[PDB]
Amino acid sequence: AMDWQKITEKMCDFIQEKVKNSQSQGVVLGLSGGIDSALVATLCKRALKENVFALLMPTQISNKANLEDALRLCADLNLEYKIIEIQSILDAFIKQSENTTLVSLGNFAARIRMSLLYDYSALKNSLVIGTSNKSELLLGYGTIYGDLACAFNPIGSLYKSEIYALAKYLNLHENFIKKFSYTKIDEGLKALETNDEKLLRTLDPSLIAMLKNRMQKNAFKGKMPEILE
Amino acid sequence: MDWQKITEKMCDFIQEKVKNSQSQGVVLGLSGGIDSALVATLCKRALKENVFALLMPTQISNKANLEDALRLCADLNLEYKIIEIQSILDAFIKQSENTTLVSLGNFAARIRMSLLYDYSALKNSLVIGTSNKSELLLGYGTIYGDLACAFNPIGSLYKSEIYALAKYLNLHENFIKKGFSYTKIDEGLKALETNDEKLLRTLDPSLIAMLKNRMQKNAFKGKMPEILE
C-alpha cells in the first residue's frame, strides 16, 4: 500500500508539464472500455479540463459491455469524444494481407487505432497520451507502433495491480474494477526488476522462467531502431 | 572515403541482426527511391534468398518509380509483392475530419508500415529501415510511419553519401540521376553535428538558422515516449 493522493498529484503535474512545454493545446487518447484507459482519461480531465479528447474505436458495434462502459465514462467526465468503428479500415488491410490469423488482425487493429489517434492529434493540435501499464510494458503484450505508440505515458511505471488500487482510490466506476494486493505475475515482475533475491527464492521457478522468457524476447519493443555507425 | 570497407561493414551488420534474432531474414518497403534500392542491394548481398520487398504505391498507372522498383527486383532476384494502397487509404480518409496533403501522406506512411509489419510476421523476418541521416536530422519522415523499423544500416550516411555509395555499388543510373561532393544542406548538417566552428563561419547564416530550426523542432522523433517516474 502507497500514497495515492501524492501519486495522483504527481501525475497531474506531469500531464500539465507536457502540454505547457509543448506547442500543443491538449491531449487525445484511445478509450476502449478498459481500466487503464479510463484511469488515464480520468487523470487527464482533472489535469487539463476542456483540452481532452477521446477516440473510441471498436472493431464492431453491437452490444459489447466495453462500449457501454466507455460511453458511460465519457458522459460522466464530460469528455469530448468520437466513436469510430474500424471494421472497414480493417477489412481493407486484410484484403491486402497474405496471412489470416487472429494475431494478424489484432496487430492491424492496433495500428489503425494509432493512425486515427495521430490524425486527430494533428487536427486538434494535441499530443497522444499512452495508456500502457508497466506489466504490459515488461511482458510485451502490446503491438509496436500500435498501442505502444504515444508522446508520453503517466501510468507506464505502475503495475497492473497498482492500476487497480489507484483506480479504486479515484472512485472509477466499479465495472472497471470488477473486470491492495499484487497478483502472482506482478510480484514476480517486481521481484525481478528490483533484484529482490530474497522474495525470488520464495517464488515458483516455472513462473519466473516464463516471466524471464517474455521480457527477454520482447525487450526490443522498448528500444529505438539501431542505426549503424 | 572507403566504400568497399563501408559495404562490408554494413553486410556484417545486417547478418548480425538476423543471426542474433529468432528471425530468418528481412523485409523492406521499396518505393523506387535511391535509399530503398540501395538497402535492397545490400540485403541481397548479405542475406541471399532471405529478403522480401513490398512495393506500395498509392496508385498504379504509369509512374517511373514503379518501373524502376520492378526493374530492380527482377535484376536482384528479390522476392516481392506490389500492394496498391489507395483502398486502405480511402478507408482512413472516410474517418478523418481533416483533409490535407500532409494528412494523406501520413496515413500513407503508416499504412506501409502496417503492411510491412504484417508481412514480417508472415515471413518470420525483421523490417529493415531505409532512412538516411539527412532525413533523420531534418525530421522529414512520419513517426511510426517510415521511421518504424527494427534496424537501419544507412541511418548514419548523409544523402550525398548515399549517392556516392550507390554509385560505388553500380545501382541502376535512374537512381543516381533522380570523388563525390556534399550538397550545401548536407555540409551544414555535417558541420553542425561535428561542431566544425571553422566551416560554420564559412557558411550562409540563413541556411544554418533553418537547419537549426528543423532539427530542434523535430528532435522528438528520434526519442522514445517519456514515461513519468
Swiss-Prot record, chain A:
Give EC number(s), comma-separated. Answer: 6.3.1.5
Bilayer-crossing regions: none
What organism does this protein naturally occur in? Answer: Campylobacter jejuni subsp. jejuni serotype O:2 (strain ATCC 700819 / NCTC 11168)
Xref: InterPro entries: NAD/GMP_synthase (IPR022310), NAD_synthase (IPR003694), NH(3)-dep_NAD(+)_synth (IPR022926), Rossmann-like_a/b/a_fold (IPR014729)
The task this protein performs is described as: Catalyzes the ATP-dependent amidation of deamido-NAD to form NAD. Uses ammonia as a nitrogen source.
Gene Ontology cellular component list: cytoplasm
UniProt name for this protein? NH(3)-dependent NAD(+) synthetase
Check the record and name the NCBIfam families matching this protein. nadE, PRK13980.1
Q: Where does deamido-NAD(+) bind?
A: R111
Q: Which residues bind ATP?
A: G30, L31, S32, G33, G34, I35, D36, S37, T131, K160
Q: Which domain of life is it from?
A: Bacteria
Which UniProt keywords are listed? ATP-binding, Ligase, Magnesium, Metal-binding, NAD, Nucleotide-binding
Record GO biological process:
NAD biosynthetic process
According to the entry, what is the taxonomic lineage of the organism? Bacteria, Pseudomonadati, Campylobacterota, Epsilonproteobacteria, Campylobacterales
| Record-listed Mg(2+) binding positions | D36, E136
Q: Return the similarity comment.
A: Belongs to the NAD synthetase family.
Keyword Protein biosynthesis assigned to the entry: answer is no
Q: Which HAMAP family match?
A: NadE_ammonia_dep (MF_00193)
Extract the GO molecular function terms from the UniProt entry. ATP binding; glutaminase activity; metal ion binding; NAD+ synthase (glutamine-hydrolyzing) activity; NAD+ synthase activity
Q: Name its pathway.
A: Cofactor biosynthesis; NAD(+) biosynthesis; NAD(+) from deamido-NAD(+) (ammonia route): step 1/1
Which reactions are catalysed by this chain?
deamido-NAD(+) + NH4(+) + ATP = AMP + diphosphate + NAD(+) + H(+)
Quaternary assembly:
Homodimer.
